[PDB]
Amino acid sequence: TSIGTGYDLSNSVFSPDGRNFQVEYAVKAVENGTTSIGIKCNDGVVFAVEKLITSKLLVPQKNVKIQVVDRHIGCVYSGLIPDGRHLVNRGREEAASFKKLYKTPIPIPAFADRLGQYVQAHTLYNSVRPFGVSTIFGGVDKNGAHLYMLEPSGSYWGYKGAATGKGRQSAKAELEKLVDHHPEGLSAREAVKQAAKIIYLAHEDNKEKDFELEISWCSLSETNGLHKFVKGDLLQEAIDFAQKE
Amino acid sequence: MFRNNYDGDTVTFSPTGRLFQVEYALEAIKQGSVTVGLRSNTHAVLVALKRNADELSSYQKKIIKCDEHMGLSLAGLAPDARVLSNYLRQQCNYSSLVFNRKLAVERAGHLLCDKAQKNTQSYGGRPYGVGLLIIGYDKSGAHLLEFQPSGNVTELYGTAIGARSQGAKTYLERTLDTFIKIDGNPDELIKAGVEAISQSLRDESLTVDNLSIAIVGKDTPFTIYDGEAVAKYI
């Protein structure tokens, strides 16, 4: 059963099949978010998102969609806005605390584990609902580049390429194809162009709406391991490469 | 029908993934009176239509100042408007006193957003049912933030929230290419806001008492006009 009446009206309850349903409904909520992707380069991670420009009133260059948890960790989610940015703030707090204590940037696996523990904690007690956002995050540390994606259930895995949101199936298929064609690892410059291609392919689901796409990437070599947005000539090059499709 | 079984509280998703109890809070804004805000690089303006309980009563305070550089206008629930306005004023005082620093509007928006979010997860509490427009001028330039009870804070050149806000918002979309360029004239900016709000009125046209305006910018600290002071703009 896809609904399981009775056992889904509260959090922290197992259904007869062993599933706890509120987490499943939270996963269903992730389906409604804007399509977002993250690609693990040979030496970095590239993030891209299809930010739908809802209205002309918004000032574009200041209402960002990608968030920096720490100067070396990039984070981007899809799902409920409140839960998403609250999780972003909490992860930023955790990274700042770790930097304050150990005087060094937090390694990505430790940050991912801390966020997984935080999110999973909300699936335990019935007074709180599970987070409704699937969060893609990653960066560069002493061990190289890591890309992660934690679900509303709290589960997370290391990904060579991840996608979340509404336009997720086509994006994930194209990302599987990309990883297949480049088993040796993509260069960050090529990865940005491929991410632009993938996002443009994902937009074909909702062509009727105008859109913009933010691209940000952290690479050990090209950006010294600091997360920066793509602007200027490189963004236009990635566009022109994507416009052929 | 099936919505009725899952909107009991803000701690339960519906099988479609929707969180009804906060969609209701966002719909609560539509009960409140229209308020309009618009921005130019030199000044930012708020325009609010005040409502009175009866002909023998004084009008509601739609516009609140939190500091000499920033203020806000709000629509929705009074009990939540009080809480959020008081919290933001307290935080402005905290920033100005403990840190000797004017609270940046961009920081203030997210600082209020974080408080707004927590109510949408814990049982017993309910989402705030008020949407408010933070307006101010700081070192980075003019600002105008439309805060929604879902915890969404967004930078807008101009916006309108409240009952029949669609007309004012459409007029703002149609004249964004113009009202931004005013850039220095406060009178003309307030006038443009006044046409914007005038599109949202079905009855009870603008009057010296029901209309209220605010402005802030490079040279003007947040100042509120009402009564005879706004007779020239009507």
């Binding site: 909490r90 707090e93 935080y118 909300h122 007690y125 007074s127 709180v128 | 927590k118 997860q121 814990s122």
Partner: peptide, 10 residues
Amino acid sequence: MQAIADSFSV
């Protein structure tokens, strides 16, 4: 819940 976390936040 989150009130407990906020107390331990700093």
